[PDB]
Amino acid sequence: GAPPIMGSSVYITVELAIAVLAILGNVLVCWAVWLNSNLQNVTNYFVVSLAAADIAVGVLAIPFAITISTGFCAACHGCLFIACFVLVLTQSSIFSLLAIAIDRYIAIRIPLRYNGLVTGTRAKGIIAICWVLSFAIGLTPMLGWNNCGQPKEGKNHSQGCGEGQVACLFEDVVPMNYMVYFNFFACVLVPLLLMLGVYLRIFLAARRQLADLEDNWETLNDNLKVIEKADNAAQVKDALTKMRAAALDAQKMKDFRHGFDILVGQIDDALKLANEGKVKEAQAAAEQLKTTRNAYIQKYLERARSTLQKEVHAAKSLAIIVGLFALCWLPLHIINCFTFFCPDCSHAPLWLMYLAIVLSHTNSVVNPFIYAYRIREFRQTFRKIIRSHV
Numbered sequence: 001g002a003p004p005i006m007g008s009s010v011y012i013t014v015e016l017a018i019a020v021l022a023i024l025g026n027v028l029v030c031w032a033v034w035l036n037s038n039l040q041n042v043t044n045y046f047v048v049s050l051a052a053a054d055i056a057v058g059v060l061a062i063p064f065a066i067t068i069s070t071g072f073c074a075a076c077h078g079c080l081f082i083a084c085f086v087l088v089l090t091q092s093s094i095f096s097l098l099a100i101a102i103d104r105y106i107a108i109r110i111p112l113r114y115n116g117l118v119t120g121t122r123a124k125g126i127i128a129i130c131w132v133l134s135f136a137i138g139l140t141p142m143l144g145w146n147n148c149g150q151p152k153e154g155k156n157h158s159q160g161c162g163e164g165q166v167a168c169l170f171e172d173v174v175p176m177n178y179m180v181y182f183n184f185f186a187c188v189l190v191p192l193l194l195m196l197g198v199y200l201r202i203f204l205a206a207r208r209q210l211a212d213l214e215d216n217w218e219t220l221n222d223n224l225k226v227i228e229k230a231d232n233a234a235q236v237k238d239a240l241t242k243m244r245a246a247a248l249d250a251q252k253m254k255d256f257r258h259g260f261d262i263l264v265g266q267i268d269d270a271l272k273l274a275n276e277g278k279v280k281e282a283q284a285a286a287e288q289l290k291t292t293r294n295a296y297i298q299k300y301l302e303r304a305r306s307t308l309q310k311e312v313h314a315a316k317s318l319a320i321i322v323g324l325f326a327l328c329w330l331p332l333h334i335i336n337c338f339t340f341f342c343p344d345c346s347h348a349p350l351w352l353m354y355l356a357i358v359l360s361h362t363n364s365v366v367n368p369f370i371y372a373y374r375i376r377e378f379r380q381t382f383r384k385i386i387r388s389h390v
């Protein structure tokens with residue numbers, strides 16, 4: 001077998017390349033949110049916490065990963081910290097990603113209550129709490145769920161380690177049942193399936209809300225046709241009742257309210273004439289709704305449709321971030337599953353183990369590119385920062 005330093009040099013060089021890109025890209029994200037008030041919303045406070053976790057991957061986790069690949073002799077609980085710290089940052093990333101999904105779900109389901117419910121203060125408290133929990137979850141092996149009590153005495157003696165020391169290798173100190181059941185199934189897989197369900201509900205809400213907008217609009221126009229060719233006052237009354245309900249329903253901002261005030265007032269005018277049996281005069285009054293429809297109602301329809309389409313597109317951009325997180329981390333989890341569940345299968349080869357580790361670290365590079373390609377407000381802030389400075 002080739003000298004280990006050769007393959008190790010490749011892995012270390014690649015890790016350092018990734019640490020540099022993770023730092024720069026996510027420093028740039030944080031710098032953008034700090035400078036641009038348009039980016040200073042509650043959603044982006046989770047984006048920032050997520051960016052800080054990825055900066056920490058380059059500053060600390062990658063240097064730790066480089067250290068543990070050497071198998072150096074170390075006290076077992078110090079080895080555990082080196083080995084498990086990255087699990088803290090990944091758990092924090094899960095919480096930030098989940099809060100973002102719930103944040104956007106709240107914004108599309110109850111937008112009028114959003115600013116009263118989701119505030120910057122409460123977001124900070126949630127973020128602080130999630131970091132605490134991430135340390136508890138990620139460092140759970142440091143509380144006794146480890147293999148420090150069953151050291152590899154063959155490795156420790158050949159490595160020449162001292163009293164209470166072990167050859168510091170990830171799979172010799174971290175239990176695989178912890179990695180599969182606790183970390184993967186419970187703390188990663190379950191939150192990802194929840195995020196999937198949240199985003200599905202976000203898209204269902206938008207689809208259902210866009211459909212109501214268009215259904216109310218068609219109800220308005222169809223009933224105008226009904227009124228125009230109606231043959232008696234009663235056919236006009238029934239047509240006008242179905243419009244008044246749609247008018248009040250669509251009403252549930254200065255020029256918006258004034259438009260529906262005009263609309264409802266004209267319907268009531270036509271309704272009163274129709275109750276008095278004045279057919280032609282009711283039809284002529286109902287015909288004046290077209291003015292209001294073209295001047296006010298069409299502009300509100302188009303503006304409400306545009307907001308909803310923006311929320312769909314934004315939700316897609318954030319879902320892509322969740323999907324790249326899964327793409328980058330699942331191979332490592334899936335390999336552990338094979339290692340744990342198939343003791344009769346050969347262990348995955350070393351070159352694959354480190355490709356899977358490298359892939360997981362690349363996730364801390366991608367998020368700033370998604371923002372730059374998919375979020376105009378980030379892309380524009382990135383340009384101004386770059387060309388004003390570098």
Ligand SMILES: CC(C)CCC[C@@H](C)[C@H]1CC[C@H]2[C@@H]3CC=C4C[C@@H](O)CC[C@]4(C)[C@H]3CC[C@]12C
Nearest residue numbers: 060064073074075076077078079080081082165
């Ligand atoms: C706040 C940031 C900048 C500082 C990070 C401190 C890091 C580098 C420190 C904190 C605790 C330290 C570990 C504590 C215990 C041991 C056991 C010892 O037998 C080998 C070194 C090792 C594994 C240390 C390595 C370096 C270490 C991980």
Ligand SMILES: CC(C)CCC[C@@H](C)[C@H]1CC[C@H]2[C@@H]3CC=C4C[C@@H](O)CC[C@]4(C)[C@H]3CC[C@]12C
Nearest residue numbers: 326327330331332334335338345346347348349
């Ligand atoms: C999210 C996507 C990319 C999932 C990718 C699936 C990857 C991780 C899967 C697909 C095929 C899998 C390999 C199939 C066969 C073996 C032989 C066994 O003795 C050890 C595990 C090993 C080497 C598997 C490791 C994990 C593996 C490489």
Ligand SMILES: CC(C)CCC[C@@H](C)[C@H]1CC[C@H]2[C@@H]3CC=C4C[C@@H](O)CC[C@]4(C)[C@H]3CC[C@]12C
Nearest residue numbers: 189330333334335337338339340341342343345
């Ligand atoms: C992320 C979604 C797709 C579900 C998670 C995929 C994981 C849990 C699935 C996909 C493929 C599955 C593996 C397929 C084959 C084997 C070999 C068997 O001898 C032990 C179980 C094991 C190792 C499975 C464990 C669970 C597994 C890794």
Ligand SMILES: Nc1nc(NCCc2ccc(O)cc2)nc2nc(-c3ccco3)nn12
Nearest residue numbers: 169170171179183332333336350353354357
């Ligand atoms: N299984 C595993 N191994 C390692 N490193 C050690 C790789 C290795 C595996 C076997 C061997 O004989 C020598 C080295 N880091 C690892 N990190 C993770 C991880 C992080 C998140 C989910 O899994 N799993 N994982």
Ligand SMILES: CCCCCCCC/C=C\CCCCCCCC(=O)O
Nearest residue numbers: 058059063066067068070071072073
């Ligand atoms: C911006 C923060 C940068 C932090 C410093 C980065 C340079 C350190 C990176 C890797 C050093 C790895 C230390 C080698 C482990 C010791 C090997 C051994 O004891 O056998």
Ligand code: NA
Nearest residue numbers: 053054093364
């Ligand atoms: Na991350």
